[PDB]
Amino acid sequence: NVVREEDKLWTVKYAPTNLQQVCGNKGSVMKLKNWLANWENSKKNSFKHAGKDGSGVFRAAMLYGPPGIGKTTAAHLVAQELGYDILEQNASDVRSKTLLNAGVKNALDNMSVVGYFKHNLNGKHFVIIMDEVDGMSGGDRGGVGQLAQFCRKTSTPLILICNERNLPKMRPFDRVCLDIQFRRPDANSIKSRLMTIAIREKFKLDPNVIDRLIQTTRGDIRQVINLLSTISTTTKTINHENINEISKAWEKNIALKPFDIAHKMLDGQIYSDIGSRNFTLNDKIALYFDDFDFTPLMIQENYLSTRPSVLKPGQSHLEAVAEAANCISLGDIVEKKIRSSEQLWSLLPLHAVLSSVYPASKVAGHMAGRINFTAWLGQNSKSAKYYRLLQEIHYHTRLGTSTDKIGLRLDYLPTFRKRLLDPFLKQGADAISSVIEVMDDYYLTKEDWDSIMEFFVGPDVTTAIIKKIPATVKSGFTRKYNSMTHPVAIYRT
Amino acid sequence: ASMLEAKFEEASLFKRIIDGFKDCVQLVNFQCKEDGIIAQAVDDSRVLLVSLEIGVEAFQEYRCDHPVTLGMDLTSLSKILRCGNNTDTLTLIADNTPDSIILLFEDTKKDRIAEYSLKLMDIDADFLKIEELQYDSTLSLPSSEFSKIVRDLSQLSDSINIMITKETIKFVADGDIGSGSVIIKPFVDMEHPETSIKLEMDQPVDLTFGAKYLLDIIKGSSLSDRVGIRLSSEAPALFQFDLKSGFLQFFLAPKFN
Amino acid sequence: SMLEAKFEEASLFKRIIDGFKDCVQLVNFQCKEDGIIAQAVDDSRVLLVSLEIGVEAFQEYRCDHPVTLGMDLTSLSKILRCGNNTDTLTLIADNTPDSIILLFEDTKKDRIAEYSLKLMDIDADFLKIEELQYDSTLSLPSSEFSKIVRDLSQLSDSINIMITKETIKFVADGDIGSGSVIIKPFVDMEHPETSIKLEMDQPVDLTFGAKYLLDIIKGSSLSDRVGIRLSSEAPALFQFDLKSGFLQFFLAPKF
Amino acid sequence: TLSLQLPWVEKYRPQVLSDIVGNKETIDRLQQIAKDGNMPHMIISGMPGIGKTTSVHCLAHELLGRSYADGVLELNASDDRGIDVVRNQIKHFAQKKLHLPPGKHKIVILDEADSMTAGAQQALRRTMELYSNSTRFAFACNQSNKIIEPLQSRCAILRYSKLSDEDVLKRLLQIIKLEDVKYTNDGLEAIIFTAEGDMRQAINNLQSTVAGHGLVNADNVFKIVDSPHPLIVKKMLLASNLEDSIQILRTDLWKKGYSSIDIVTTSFRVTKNLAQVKESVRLEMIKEIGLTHMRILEGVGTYLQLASMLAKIHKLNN
DNA sequence: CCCCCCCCCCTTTTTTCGGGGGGGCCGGGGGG
DNA sequence: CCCCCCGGCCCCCCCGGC
DNA sequence: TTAGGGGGGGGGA
Numbered sequence A: 001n002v003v004r005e006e007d008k009l010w011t012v013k014y015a016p017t018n019l020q021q022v023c024g025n026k027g028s029v030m031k032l033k034n035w036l037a038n039w040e041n042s043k044k045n046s047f048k049h050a051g052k053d054g055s056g057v058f059r060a061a062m063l064y065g066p067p068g069i070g071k072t073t074a075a076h077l078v079a080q081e082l083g084y085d086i087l088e089q090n091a092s093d094v095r096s097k098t099l100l101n102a103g104v105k106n107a108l109d110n111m112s113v114v115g116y117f118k119h120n121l122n123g124k125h126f127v128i129i130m131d132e133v134d135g136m137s138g139g140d141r142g143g144v145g146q147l148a149q150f151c152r153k154t155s156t157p158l159i160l161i162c163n164e165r166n167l168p169k170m171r172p173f174d175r176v177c178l179d180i181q182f183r184r185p186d187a188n189s190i191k192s193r194l195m196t197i198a199i200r201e202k203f204k205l206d207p208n209v210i211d212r213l214i215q216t217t218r219g220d221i222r223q224v225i226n227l228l229s230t231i232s233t234t235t236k237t238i239n240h241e242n243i244n245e246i247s248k249a250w251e252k253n254i255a256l257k258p259f260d261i262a263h264k265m266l267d268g269q270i271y272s273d274i275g276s277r278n279f280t281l282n283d284k285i286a287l288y289f290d291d292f293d294f295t296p297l298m299i300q301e302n303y304l305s306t307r308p309s310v311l312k313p314g315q316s317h318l319e320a321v322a323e324a325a326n327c328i329s330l331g332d333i334v335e336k337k338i339r340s341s342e343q344l345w346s347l348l349p350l351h352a353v354l355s356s357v358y359p360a361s362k363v364a365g366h367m368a369g370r371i372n373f374t375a376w377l378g379q380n381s382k383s384a385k386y387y388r389l390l391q392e393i394h395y396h397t398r399l400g401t402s403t404d405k406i407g408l409r410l411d412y413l414p415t416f417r418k419r420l421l422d423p424f425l426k427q428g429a430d431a432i433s434s435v436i437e438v439m440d441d442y443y444l445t446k447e448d449w450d451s452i453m454e455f456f457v458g459p460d461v462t463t464a465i466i467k468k469i470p471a472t473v474k475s476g477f478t479r480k481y482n483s484m485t486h487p488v489a490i491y492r493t
Numbered sequence B: 001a002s003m004l005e006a007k008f009e010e011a012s013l014f015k016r017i018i019d020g021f022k023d024c025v026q027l028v029n030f031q032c033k034e035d036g037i038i039a040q041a042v043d044d045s046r047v048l049l050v051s052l053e054i055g056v057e058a059f060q061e062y063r064c065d066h067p068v069t070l071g072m073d074l075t076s077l078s079k080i081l082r083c084g085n086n087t088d089t090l091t092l093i094a095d096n097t098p099d100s101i102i103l104l105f106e107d108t109k110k111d112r113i114a115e116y117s118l119k120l121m122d123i124d125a126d127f128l129k130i131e132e133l134q135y136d137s138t139l140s141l142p143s144s145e146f147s148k149i150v151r152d153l154s155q156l157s158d159s160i161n162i163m164i165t166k167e168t169i170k171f172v173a174d175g176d177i178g179s180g181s182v183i184i185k186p187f188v189d190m191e192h193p194e195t196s197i198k199l200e201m202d203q204p205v206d207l208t209f210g211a212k213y214l215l216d217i218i219k220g221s222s223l224s225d226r227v228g229i230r231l232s233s234e235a236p237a238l239f240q241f242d243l244k245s246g247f248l249q250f251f252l253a254p255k256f257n
Numbered sequence C: 001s002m003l004e005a006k007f008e009e010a011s012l013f014k015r016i017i018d019g020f021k022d023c024v025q026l027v028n029f030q031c032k033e034d035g036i037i038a039q040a041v042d043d044s045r046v047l048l049v050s051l052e053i054g055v056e057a058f059q060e061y062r063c064d065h066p067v068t069l070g071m072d073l074t075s076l077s078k079i080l081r082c083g084n085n086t087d088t089l090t091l092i093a094d095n096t097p098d099s100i101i102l103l104f105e106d107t108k109k110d111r112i113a114e115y116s117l118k119l120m121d122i123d124a125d126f127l128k129i130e131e132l133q134y135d136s137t138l139s140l141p142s143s144e145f146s147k148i149v150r151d152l153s154q155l156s157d158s159i160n161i162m163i164t165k166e167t168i169k170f171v172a173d174g175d176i177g178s179g180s181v182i183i184k185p186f187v188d189m190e191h192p193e194t195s196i197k198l199e200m201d202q203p204v205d206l207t208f209g210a211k212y213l214l215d216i217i218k219g220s221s222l223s224d225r226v227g228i229r230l231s232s233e234a235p236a237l238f239q240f241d242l243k244s245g246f247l248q249f250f251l252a253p254k255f
Numbered sequence D: 001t002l003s004l005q006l007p008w009v010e011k012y013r014p015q016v017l018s019d020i021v022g023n024k025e026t027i028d029r030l031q032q033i034a035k036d037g038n039m040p041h042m043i044i045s046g047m048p049g050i051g052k053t054t055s056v057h058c059l060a061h062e063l064l065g066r067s068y069a070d071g072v073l074e075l076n077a078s079d080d081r082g083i084d085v086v087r088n089q090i091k092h093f094a095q096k097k098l099h100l101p102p103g104k105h106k107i108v109i110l111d112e113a114d115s116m117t118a119g120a121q122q123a124l125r126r127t128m129e130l131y132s133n134s135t136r137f138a139f140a141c142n143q144s145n146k147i148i149e150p151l152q153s154r155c156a157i158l159r160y161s162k163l164s165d166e167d168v169l170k171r172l173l174q175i176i177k178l179e180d181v182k183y184t185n186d187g188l189e190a191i192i193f194t195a196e197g198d199m200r201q202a203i204n205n206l207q208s209t210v211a212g213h214g215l216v217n218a219d220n221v222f223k224i225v226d227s228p229h230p231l232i233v234k235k236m237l238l239a240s241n242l243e244d245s246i247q248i249l250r251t252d253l254w255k256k257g258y259s260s261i262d263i264v265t266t267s268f269r270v271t272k273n274l275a276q277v278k279e280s281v282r283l284e285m286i287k288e289i290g291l292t293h294m295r296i297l298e299g300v301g302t303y304l305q306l307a308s309m310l311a312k313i314h315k316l317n318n
Numbered sequence E: 001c002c003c004c005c006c007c008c009c010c011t012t013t014t015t016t017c018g019g020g021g022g023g024g025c026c027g028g029g030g031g032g
Numbered sequence F: 001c002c003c004c005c006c007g008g009c010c011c012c013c014c015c016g017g018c
Numbered sequence G: 001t002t003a004g005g006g007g008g009g010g011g012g013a
């Protein structure tokens, strides 16, 4: 039997048949086609001779963009046009480490039986299209890193499609694929197709309301077609008389991203009487819940970079900043309470008020620059690394010093600076013996020396000081240290 | 219950046939015509093609009005086939435009009937045309020896290389832990003709294959006592297990040089 | 190829691996003229494994110079899983240890399969074992000891062995309940192997960890009789005997 | 007695689309779909007890007729709906061969889809696309934002609003006429007021009042359905004098058995939505209420803490 | 053709208990 | 005696207000 | 009201 076209979804009945029917992202489609067409030539060159486009140093391509823009269709059409066999995997299949190593791993360098039995010069090879890669779950067992390694060792073209490129789980794919971006289609590129669908489906649509519908779905062509199909069932005319209701009913509710959340939260308009009556306090609290792990950090980062428009009479910017900082401190206390052994998550809404909403309301205005990403995370990582180094050094020197790690950092290290680095600056290469003797007296290693010399701050920074030392002195120091037997403090057994 | 009626005198034959290739393919389309039942399927990796033939001589009775196409998920079929004793008669019954098939297990000594209904699947696939090709390599060996060698070599490496030249067969596996090589030579014995390894080389051959697919293929050792491997230069290798009235063929795509 | 050790049946060698392939992973096979000797220690530093095999057990041991055939038991098990248990194993090692040659040969079909394994370096510090006069020395069938250990490892994680005048007691007390097994020395003639022997000098009462004992009992595949030597102030020894060698486990009593 | 009377919520559950009150446009669209067919993938969202599951079941029945048994696969939160179920059971149902009327398709109902894990939702994406020619998906949820955007892109959106008091009165009067219930206008008004747009709650309260007192009047209705405590909290927070607020706290909430944690949570929720009060004043009140809530969570759930919270709130407005 | 304007899209990642889900060995049992 | 099957600890990642 | 800066693509003196 066969399926009548009347029983098929409009998105399938009116799907693109060739690459010239794809709306928007023409440059991305051309880039993907060029990358796939010269894959064999790049393989003959070992993927080392980057071409004019620079796509010759990539064995795989990664297509990314918002939902419903034509990524999968473009990939399939480009694969079919050049005459390759397609092996498609998606989230409906198991793609764990073991399954990936037992499945597509073999197909990476295997001939296609379908290609052989259906024979172009490229029909016997595979074009592996891994779709919904962002849906994969896991850090090691998930197989994302295994897929990244496959991208490096693939012997055939491999295309990855994802919707959220900027995620930690997509970190392994940083610089292993040709990154192609598909952006939201413009109204003009899809106007003709919408008109054709409307005249084919026999309903009346005013061309002027098209832009409103495209803005309602945030560029999703599939959602636009679904909206047309649903509304045309009863409402046979789409015009300005009913555009508002249709837009409101079918308005996508997509959570904002940290930068957008920070921008909207720090806008004074929503904190005015009219703005407050339009964007209510409940809406502001919900905006925080779009990303509750990053919103307070963004607010704390960007609450000092505004020209306020909500200052109370007789109140300066600094006073509002101080009040916001006090409320941020209270919110930090609440956050500490939440993530304790008690697990008081019911306090999450209050945190939203204490960390984002209230402090923003005090400095809400116009951004006085660019919205920056929170620097607390990198600083915390740096602090953790330095604390680990300090612990290692303290326990290396524990048997010789009577103090703790904080006392070692604050008292001992400045004195050690005058007996480990300063002599080299005065006695040149003749201070190696004394410095090595001092290091041995405290069971210190060369890596301990380097870590020590990185702790000093402010006027005691040493990077330039150490660099200015003649290379011969450093080479002699290394040679002398490596040509001697040094004592050991902690015997790991 | 008139269109298609196929009776296996023993239900174990069909269960074994399904067991032979249920670990590689999941959804299989069976075409039943007045001449017998054929089936063609392709695995997910699209490198192994499974073909099955069952003639009218393997059926105690076989009546098919006009050709009928049945899509089946081998997991459900295998689960159903475990519910009947290996010594009972198994009748497959199908009708026009069937949404399901009937599997009737009947035992002679007891007055017991076990009727099961299996829902059919809608599968969209094309019947690949397999044209005869003059393979310049043909080796017929006992199934047990092939299974043993494949299992032994799969432990070390993920790929196995078969090399055919004058009076010698070499199976080689290379892996991180180590390597393993097995050399067989043609041999014939009149007292035990079922262990006679045979070779027919027109041109030397060297082909590498995936260990997983060979491991899946050797699961058909149950059906037949000997396996026939026909190899080529740049064409899929044919692994055939012969049945009384039909056959089970695996076309495996070799790894690119 | 100075090292050439032949095994009439490879199964023996496989069994040797089965004895200690769970407690330890990487070992060094210091093959010398007298034979092969290995010493491994678990990650917790509480159990030792000492294995020795002599030229008498080996069919044609013909090593010429000292060699340290370090290997991982995981891969050795895989290579030993290939080949019938009745085939001969001609282990062959060359001048510089880089890879080992496990050659399996069958005479019924006059066919030979050559497998190789890569060798890895291990920072071993082999320690010679001193001989001490242990307080008590008992010997019982391996099956009985394994059964007792498996039975008493379910009711508690610690098993107490009490050796006293004509009596050996295995006790395990937990939250669900207690369990005691009392075995007295006895001798049989129609089945000499099914006998329990005890040498008793001082009363002994030592508590061991059940999980160590579970690993130890796996050596039953080698020998059908297991001999345990226990002392108040020294690690207990559990020995399984081979044709021309031994496999011993040293354990530290807990409290 | 070991017998149970069937609840009116089940005895009078609508069986056809024409018997559903509220959301007239959406129900009309559902009827039009049931008439023509070609049902699209849809997600129905709304507040509890407004007729979402009833609408989905009525549409499925009106579309499939005698084939309902084989053409409908219904799964809810009480059934296993993991990734394995999606990849094996739903896939098998979608791939099943079933001969249906010319313009009909199989239906997969996923009630309370907001409770599904992200993995199952991601897995459903390609299953919906590859088998749309034979199967269609209808999700029913309370929070549409919990459905991943890729799934929302593939489905139509049907948002259900609160039922107006007129619709509730209409349905209650129909049930009363079909049950010969003796009622007074004030009783029905009280039932509607306490229902707060929830048809299920209204019907349950009416049945309980009838079975417990017989006559459906204001007095009997209020003896079954207690006064909503959120309104009492709102009155307490909007009182002019501190003495009045303390009296409301003591007489209407504390002595009635309401817990301090419930009182503080309700106070926070009410303050968050007190549009009459300015946003800054509400923020200060929320800070005070949060301090009180933190004190209560630490173990001091005393009446003195609530009195101090009320005193601080009054001081803020002075 | 370079130039102009407009629009869209990117900047980037830490953690205290309990519950639930999903994947992987392991080992007991049945069976040939 | 040995292979296949399939239930049962262990492990690791992700939420958590409404 | 548009945070700053870079990338895409249709229009055009």
Ligand SMILES: Nc1ncnc2c1ncn2[C@@H]1O[C@H](COP(=O)(O)OP(=O)(O)OP(O)(O)=S)[C@@H](O)[C@H]1O
Residues within 6 Å of the ligand: A010, A011, A012, A014, A015, A016, A021, A022, A023, A024, A066, A067, A068, A069, A070, A071, A072, A073, A074, A163, A185, A221, A222, A225, D150, D153
């Ligand atoms: N650029 C486009 N031009 C025309 N139709 C499109 C386009 N993009 C999407 N569509 C329509 O939407 C349907 C689905 O398109 P897909 O490419 O599958 O969506 P997508 O871009 O892959 O987004 P996701 O990640 O799958 S939700 C197609 O069959 C078309 O009907």
Ligand SMILES: Nc1ncnc2c1ncn2[C@@H]1O[C@H](COP(=O)(O)OP(=O)(O)OP(O)(O)=S)[C@@H](O)[C@H]1O
Residues within 6 Å of the ligand: D008, D009, D010, D012, D013, D014, D019, D020, D021, D022, D046, D047, D048, D049, D050, D051, D052, D053, D054, D055, D141, D142, D171, D199, D200, D203
């Ligand atoms: N619009 C309505 N018209 C008539 N009766 C209704 C309506 N909505 C609800 N009811 C009654 O309330 C009962 C429960 O309604 P349901 O629709 O099953 O619950 P619900 O709307 O799904 O709430 P949730 O979100 O699933 S907790 C129905 O069986 C009816 O008796």
Ligand SMILES: [Mg+2]
Residues within 6 Å of the ligand: A071, A072, A073, A131
């Ligand atoms: Mg897609």
Ligand SMILES: [Mg+2]
Residues within 6 Å of the ligand: D053, D111
């Ligand atoms: Mg329901």
